[PDB]
């Protein structure tokens, strides 16, 4: 009764990073076959936790978070790694005892006319709490004049588009991301897959 990792990684549509998706994984044997899951991921790094057959351990819950951002900003998804995405589009805890994986998606998410499905939360009042999310889509009345729910002069919308085009280089090519949070509460661990 293995965990549904195939649903997470090989999903057709990934989420915009601002409304980053989260798939709970519980009550299943999480046998990690990333060494031969038939996909040469750009890179991989387990923060705090280790990938060296640590499957033996039993975790309470595993929250798998998914989204797409630009290669340039692939690093932003790390503990202490401040930036747009970190500060406005999902963030990890400094004590992140979890793995993170991501890869090039230019041949999955780059669209001829530009890809505008993926949106990055540009601005926000405060930095996001770890694993917090915001889907706020309200105009900000920066101006001393109102916005009347429209965007314009000193009246701004809180989102923007990555406009992915294959012509673009590695830096601005779409890169999908999957995160592995390992929860251990008082509830009996539901996932080991030793």
């Amino acid at each position, epitope marked *: 009764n293995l965990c549904p990792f195939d649903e997470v990684f090989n999903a057709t*549509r990934f989420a915009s990073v601002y409304a980053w998706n989260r798939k709970r994984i519980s009550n299943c044997v999480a046998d990690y076959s990333v060494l031969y899951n038939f996909a040469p991921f750009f890179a991989f790094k387990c923060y705090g936790v280790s990938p060296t057959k640590l499957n033996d351990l039993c975790f309470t819950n595993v929250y798998a978070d998914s989204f797409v951002i630009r290669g340039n900003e692939v690093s932003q998804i790390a503990p202490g790694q401040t930036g747009n995405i970190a500060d406005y589009n999902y963030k990890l805890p400094d004590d992140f005892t979890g793995c993170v994986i991501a890869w090039n998606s230019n041949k999955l998410d780059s*669209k001829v*006319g530009g890809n505008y499905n993926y*949106l990055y939360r540009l601005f926000r009042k405060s930095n996001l709490k770890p694993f917090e999310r915001d889907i706020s889509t309200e105009i900000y009345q920066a101006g001393n004049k109102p916005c009347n729910g429209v965007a314009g002069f000193n009246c701004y919308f809180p*989102l*923007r588009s990555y406009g992915f085009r294959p012509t673009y280089g590695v830096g601005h090519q779409p890169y999908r991301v999957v995160v592995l949070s390992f929860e251990l509460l008082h509830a009996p661990a539901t996932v080991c897959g030793p």
Partner: antibody
Amino acid sequence: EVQLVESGGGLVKPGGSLRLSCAASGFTFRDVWMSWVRQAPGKGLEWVGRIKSKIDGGTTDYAAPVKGRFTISRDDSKNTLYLQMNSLKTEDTAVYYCTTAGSYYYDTVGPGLPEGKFDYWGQGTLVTVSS
Amino acid sequence: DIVMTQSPDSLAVSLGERATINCKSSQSVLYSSNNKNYLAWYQQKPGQPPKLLMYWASTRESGVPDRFSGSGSGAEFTLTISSLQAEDVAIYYCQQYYSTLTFGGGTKVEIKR
């Protein structure tokens, strides 16, 4: 190449029922938001309906005049689109195109376009609703 | 839905002259979330299917000449052909995709000779 071949148009009695069928080939069919667009003689294009990719839900939308008289279907294993037409009227006499129009702006398909484009239309069969 | 409108209905200019079409929407097709117009232009020669010219209101389809060029934003778009060629004769439709699909009234383009 890619091709969209509509079949099953003709004469049908007023109030009668007719099944249109669009056989698609060349592109990743199941990922595209397929639509029917009709055209009466001399009159302009009019969107009929849309089926989204089954991974994107498979929601159907219909226009105001055909609202709840038509029923869109899909078969991704056979790469074929259907339009079920019921309680037909003399207003409905028109040539019906199946198309990938309105898809690429929302759909999940990437840059590997078959012939370097995405918007494709069929020749479209003529539905005459006369007694 | 959105009432796509076109003007004029008929049009006729000499070879190599300025051919000018317009579009009016009952709503705005400018989506704030990406700042893109969800509008297209379609060329249809009699007896044939429509061919896509323009999408995102500006972007040309592979192989369409620079002759064609769509502009505008929001609810008052326009497609102008710099110099009208013989084959350019056709009816053109401004279809927005912002809300499902709704096509314009139509603008017939003809050559003076």
